Every structure is written in structure tokens, then in C-alpha cells.
From a paper:
To evaluate [name]’s capacity to recognize diverse peptides, the protein was incubated with an excess of defined synthesized peptides (peptides 2, 3 and 4) that were previously reported to bind [name]. Specifically, crystal structures of [name] in complex with peptide 2 (AIQSEKARKHN), peptide 3 (PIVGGHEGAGV), and peptide 4 (VMVKGPGPGREST) were solved at resolutions of 2.29 Å, 1.66 Å and 1.49 Å, respectively. Analogous to peptide 2, the initial three residues adopt a short β-strand conformation. However, in contrast to peptide 2, the subsequent portion of peptide 3 lacks a substantial quantity of basic residues, comprising several glycines and other non-bulky residues. In this case, the ligand inside the [name] binding-site does not exhibit any secondary structural elements except for the conserved β-strand at the N-terminus. The two glycine (G) residues in the peptide (residues 4 and 5) do not engage in polar interactions with [name], while the following two G residues (residues 8 and 10) establish strong stabilizing H-bonds.
The system comprises five exposed Oligopeptide Binding Proteins (OBPs) and four proteins building the ABC transporter channel. The five lipoproteins exhibit pairwise sequence identity of ~52–60% and share a very similar overall folding.
Residue numbers in the entry:
A (entry chain A): 32 to 652
B (entry chain C): 1 to 11
Write the structure that this text describes.
Amino acid sequence: SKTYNYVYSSDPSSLNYLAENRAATSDIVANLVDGLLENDQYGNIIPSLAEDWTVSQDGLTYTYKLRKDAKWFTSEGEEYAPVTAQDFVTGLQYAADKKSEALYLVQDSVAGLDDYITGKTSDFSTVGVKALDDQTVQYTLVKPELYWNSKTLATILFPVNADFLKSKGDDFGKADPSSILYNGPFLMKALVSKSAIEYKKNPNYWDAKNVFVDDVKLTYYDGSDQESLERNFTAGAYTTARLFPNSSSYEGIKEKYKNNIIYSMQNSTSYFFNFNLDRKSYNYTSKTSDIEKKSTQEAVLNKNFRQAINFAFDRTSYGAQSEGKEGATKILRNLVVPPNFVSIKGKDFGEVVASKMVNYGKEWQGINFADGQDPYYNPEKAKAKFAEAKKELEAKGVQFPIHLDKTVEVTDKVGIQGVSSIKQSIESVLGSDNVVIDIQQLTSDEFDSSGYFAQTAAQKDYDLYHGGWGPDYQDPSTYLDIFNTNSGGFLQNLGLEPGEANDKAKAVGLDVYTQMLEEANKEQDPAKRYEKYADIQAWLIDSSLVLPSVSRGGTPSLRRTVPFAAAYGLTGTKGVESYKYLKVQDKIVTTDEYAKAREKWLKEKEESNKKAQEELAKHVK
Amino acid sequence: PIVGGHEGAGV
């Protein structure tokens, strides 16, 4: 048998793929539960549980034919029941009943669903998902969505068996392998907190022929032993290893692996800093008085202040802390929407956003949003913005310096160097009599409960947050909706709760942002629609409510995985997340071999995508 | 979905 061995860092809060919007859950369930469609190696959307599908000529009705040989299994591998179309009716109703955190993906798209979720109706037979027979699911939409099929790669549209769901009650989806059923490539054999995630190939999976590893073992990695990755790889214990050029170890490693260091491409997951606009929890702070806390509360609502932070934040120095001097810029991402995520009459989205920035102020003149460079850092612009902020804020009684708390895990040595760099650059440019970045080193429980796994905005315990978004479907709105005041998935990280915008949301203009989103969403012509979302992204950059930082990818590794064997997806959770298709080999891949494989994949991908787009028309009813 | 983990795009 063959085995993939590496590491993981995020324990899931649950396995509830219908209720969670955290990647800590979907990164796991991607390997355990299939939906209607999935990805091939080229980012095409291809059959999964659905062997075929059609869309009506008006674009409102999608019908899917489920393959007859797909079954549910228990975590121990026993057969439970065949997958049926009713499981998709059950899944959507459960997501609605449980108020899933990812409901924005469907609540405004599926006919009747918003009425059902909000209690206007009580009858799920009025909602636009139907099992026409055991093999046929039909969805009915409120308006056409060319990106609807890409949404089926997100877990809120995955199926669940109603008898299992009822049998399990509130035990369904807990962090225990027996809490869900399995119809995907793997069964979950071990899920041990701060220790291990282990998968075993399901030999009875409908597509077992495309699963080339029999075992996947992930060891918990808390960040305190970055050298262990290469150490275990060289000892034959890991299949891959991320390299850390800053380390004292790197000298000899690059000697030993001169011809094996491989750099990945930057991908569509985007990270950014944001501010806590309505902080309620001060368990982790270096502020000693209520006047300091109210001063920071006022500062983060001031646009000039946020812009000053933005221009003072040296992205190159930050990237260098994990990538080294040479590679510091390889991970930089300057928009939330990746610059080539869509195009508008051949022009990349990011070049359209760039063309719209000077309109928002002359401080943006010449800005370039391409990946892999820092267009923000500018000490003279930062100091000028801060001087205007300070006059506005001082008149409100605000006291300086403004203290900003940033958390980091105490074991996360590389992360600690990263946040140290942000402290150094901001304070160097603006002056530590004006701004102080207070780093709070937290235990795992402290770090989880104050940030990523906090369950309410009031529990967020920081002034500055560094999080990110992985796209759920193929449209700029997957990213840009996350700050909307009605239902934005990233509102709680800004200290705001979805619902009516409060005075702090209105102070920073997120109500206007939300109205812009609603108007852009009405556009169905892709070029016009994307241009409206480009305006929205430009507004957001100018607001400096996010400070774009880095992407995933762009990092050095050693590898015994086969290049470009795994699925790839621009959006959704059935590409790199899945260990289906992935292959392992005996030879450590060389840089030259990887580059030859990459150029081959890049060329095949364009050809493959063009044929996939031609195939689309055959599916129109 | 929401992505977290360590600091930035950390392991």
C-alpha cells in the first residue's frame, strides 16, 4: 500500500459540514463526503455523485442525475444505505433549520428558502429543492447564477441521510468520526485533538479507482518545531516538507537539496488584516485604563487612521519573516479578490480595480495590485494620513499613542516573528508615541477562543486580526460579500453582528458598502457585473477596513508527491483539500522536473478549460 | 470559508 504523511495545525470544532463555514471543518469533510460535482486536475467542474445534469433555458432550474452505485458508509466502513436524491432535500432543510453559518451561499439563491429560514413559511415543500425520484434532484433558483454549479462544491450543498440525521439528533456532526456518514474517498480512522488526523481509503467508494493512497496520516504541528518538517521528510517519515529559509538549519538544507527546492504558485485564498470595530472583550490587552480603550475604539473608526496603518505596514519585511529575504515578496496578495480571479473584456480584475483607485484619492496614484510585490508601504503617505487622523481624533478627546492588540500563539515561532515585524514597521514609520502594536502571546485555548473559534463578535479579544477567505464559488461576490452588514461571513471578526447595521458599521460606511453589493448582484452580464464588483473592491481598499497581506502558496517545499496529480479548483473544497487523485512516489522531485511538469500542466489546463466551456452548452435543456 | 490556522498563511 502507499501512504501520505504530513502535518495539520487546526483541530475542527465539529464535523458538521452543513452548519460550519470554517475551513477547519471543510478541509476534513472534503475527504469524507462528496456532493453533486467535483474538480479534475485542471479546475474543471466534473461529475461527482451526479453523473449528469441539465439547466433550463431560463437558467432557473438545475436537474442532477445521481449515479446508482454511490452509497453511504459508517465510519467503520459498513454499508448504511445508497445515496438518494432525498438526501439533498434533507441536507438543505437541515442547513436551514440549524441556521448554518454558510447559509449566505443559498438563502438568497434557492426559491422559497429565505421565506423558510426566516419563518415566513413553515412548509419545506415550498423550497426549491425536490427529489423528483430516487436518482434525480432538482433545484429551482430565484434568478440565474452562472456560478451555481460551482456552489455545489461547497459543503452546505452536500447530502445527508435523513434517517441517520434523525437517529443521531444533537450528536450529529460532533468531533468524533462516528457522528457523520461517509460517501467520499476516505473513511476517518483517527481524529485525536492536538495529535492526529488519519484517513483510510474506502475501498467501496464509487470512485475508488481514483484514490491512489491507502492511508493519510497528519501529525499535529503547533509551530514550535519548524525544523521538524524537513527533519521528518529527510528521515523518510513525511511525504513533503515546507522549508523555512530564516532558520539556522537552512544553510545545510539548501546544500543538501540544491536541486530539490520547489516553489508553489500563489492560490485564490486571500489573507488580510482587519480591525475590531466594536471591541467588547479585554482579557488580552496591554492597555491599562478605560481612556486608552476608548481611544483605540475611536481610532479604528477613523478612515485616515486605518489608511495610515495601511501605508505603514511593510509587507516585504512581514513576508521575509517566513520566506527569507530572497522570497519575501513571493506570497504577497494586494486585493481580497485575486487580481486574475476574473477578467473584464480581457482585462484582469485587479487592473480594473487599479484603474478605479485614483478616483478615491490621489494617495492611490499609480497603485499596482499584482501579486508578488508591495504597493502599499509608503512612509511619507503614512505619516501624512496619520497627521490628519490625529487632528480629527484629538478633537474627540482621543489620547495617543493608540495601542492596538494583536494576538499570536505562544508556540507559533514563525508567526511571532511575523507580528514582531508588523510592530516594528508600523512603529518605525508612525512613531511609537503615536501607535503601539501590543503583541499578546496566548495559549492554544486562549488564541482559539478569542479569535477563529470565538462564537460571537463580543468574544473577539483583539484590536487587529489576521484572517483570510477561501472562495466558495466562482464570482467576486464570494469574497466581497463577507463584509456585508446583513449576512457577511467575516462580520464577527470585525466585531459586528449580521443584522441591522449599528452606529459603528455606519460610521465606517459598511451600510453603503452593503447597498453597493446589493446593486452589483442584480447585474447578470458578466463584464458589467464584474466591473461593478471592481468598484466595490476599490471602495474597500480605500476604506482600509482590510489591509491585504498574503496568499497561500508561493512557498518552498521538498516533495515526494507526484506533481499536478491532485485535483485543483479555483473555488470550493474539492481541489487541494482532497487527497483523492493525489499520488506519491519514491523519488524526491527535482526543481527541473517540477518546472517541466508545471509547464505541461499550465498548457494542458488552458486547452482543458476551453473544451469544458464548450461542453457546457450540451447541458442546456 | 473562513481560513485560520497559525499566523498568516502558516502551516
